[PDB]
């Protein structure tokens, strides 16, 4: 089925590859683009898998994957209808070109000098320009790694459609599920599973070594508030939990913690970060970053004269922060688009400041930008929330749940300071300069946050700065 040659080859069929395909076709209306995708699905967005797809009373949603946004309006998880793609066989000579996807196929060898890749089925494909957009593989716990096949078979590493379907099934079938990891994803899943368990009368546990949810990122006040929110959903949250081992004890999973607590459960979900998919660097002879992970690229996202990297797999040069890798939807879209533009001769640098967002449900959301690390000095400024300061209202206003879309990618032109907390802004500092911002239930203000960080001025009074965020 695979053609012998394609002008544009995109390795991996995720968010970054789809953005690049769209960019290439916009700039070159007759372009011929092939996406090679190891997963059996056509390109789709990930955020709904831990969010709106769980907030449903319709059993058909697991089959269609057409979810309802917080505003009640339906959207498909897929970036475009399957009929918008051309067949890989037709690609070389179909009038006006198109975008094809080879699903269920892995690129296993990259030969840079020969502009060639080899698939797992032995197929050889040459390219003129290549994007690596392979994303990452979920990290496991060493305690699970060392526990043997039975424990492993009863642990979900949450990333794909397949994991959504298998976990949604498990949540209807078993009595107890344990999430390991306190980050945004672990916490989203805790809230999603918690809501399911309430209707079924079952148990959800979330455990992590930090003092509270998102403890590596949020300062203690807001980390603690989040833990209480998750507890209000019915979830048993266990902070200061260091996993010693995991075994099977008369049919149940048994998690032993260093402090002496034991946790008995039916299934485990791990959400403890990501290992960038860099296997192709071996045969490709490409440099990887041993400190931050990922393929090292220049300002234009090039690994080689005709090889670019975008999305989760890229270790890029952040304009403010230096060598960096992120796991942001926004980054995958903007870096993928830019790769596509540069593959069609734009030669433009990656200067975008990537934003991140998380919704715990329709009532609580976060946004983040820049260097966000709870070990840094911070200043938090908080206020009571208004009726509009929640993900649902933000989605009602914008028409979308993908916040990188509603926020805009832009930075504000100017930021003239105007002359039971439920929202706020948190500034992360270096010598009175703001290097990162977290927004709690404040929407449509990311351009202001980008402007503050880009300008890099010293600020005498952060309480004045907070007025820009309507605090
Ligand atoms: C459940 C979940 C929820 C998330 N929610 C948010 C959110 O709310 N906000 C936010 O900012 N970010 C969120 N993220 C992160 C965001 O989704 C990612 O940053 C984004 O998916 C990265 O896109 P990508 O194209 O780089 O990688 P991916 O989407 O991982 O795509 C990579 C693809 O390449 C395939 N592949 C790998 N190797 C090969 C190979 N050799 N040959 C062929 N194919 C290969 C993989 O199977 C995969 O399909 C979430 C992530 C997850 C998993």
Swiss-Prot record:
Binding site for NAD(+) 2: 70, 367, 444
One annotated Gene Ontology cellular component of this protein: cytoplasm
Stretch list, region Disordered: 387-419
Record note on what altering residue 346 to V does: In DFNX5; uncertain significance
Ranges annotated as spanning the membrane: none
UniProt effect for mutating residue 328 to A: Allows dimerization in absence of NADH
Residue numbers of Phosphothreonine PTMs: 395
Mutagenesis or variant effect for residue 70 to A: Increases protein dimerization at lower NADH levels
Residue numbers covered by motif Nuclear localization signal: 320-325
PTM note: Under normal conditions, a 54-residue N-terminal segment is first proteolytically removed during or just after translocation into the mitochondrial intermembrane space (IMS) by the mitochondrial processing peptidase (MPP) to form the inner-membrane-anchored mature form (AIFmit). During apoptosis, it is further proteolytically processed at amino-acid position 101 leading to the generation of the mature form, which is confined to the mitochondrial IMS in a soluble form (AIFsol). Ubiquitination by XIAP/BIRC4 does not lead to proteasomal degradation. Ubiquitination at Lys-129 by XIAP/BIRC4 blocks its ability to bind DNA and induce chromatin degradation, thereby inhibiting its ability to induce cell death.
Effect recorded for residue 218 to F: In DFNX5; uncertain significance
GO BP term (any one): mitochondrial disulfide relay system
Variant or mutagenesis effect after changing residue 452 to M: In DFNX5; uncertain significance
Comp. bias intervals (Polar residues): 387-403
Catalytic activity: A + NADH + H(+) = AH2 + NAD(+)
Disease entry from the Swiss-Prot or TrEMBL record: Combined oxidative phosphorylation deficiency 6: A mitochondrial disease resulting in a neurodegenerative disorder characterized by psychomotor delay, hypotonia, areflexia, muscle weakness and wasting. Some patients manifest prenatal ventriculomegaly and severe postnatal encephalomyopathy. Charcot-Marie-Tooth disease, X-linked recessive, 4, with or without cerebellar ataxia: A neuromuscular disorder characterized by progressive sensorimotor axonal neuropathy, distal sensory impairment, difficulty walking due to peripheral neuropathy and/or cerebellar ataxia, and deafness due to auditory neuropathy. Additional features include cognitive impairment, cerebellar atrophy, dysarthria, abnormal extraocular movements, tremor, dysmetria and spasticity. The age at onset ranges from infancy to young adulthood.
Binding partners and assembly: Monomer (oxidized form). Homodimer (reduced form). Upon reduction with NADH, undergoes dimerization and forms tight, long-lived FADH2-NAD charge transfer complexes (CTC) resistant to oxidation. Also dimerizes with isoform 3 preventing its release from mitochondria. Interacts with XIAP/BIRC4. Interacts (via N-terminus) with EIF3G (via C-terminus). Interacts with PRELID1. Interacts with CHCHD4; the interaction increases in presence of NADH.
Protein name: Apoptosis-inducing factor 1, mitochondrial
Gene: AIFM1
Part of the full-length chain shown: 127 to 610 of 613
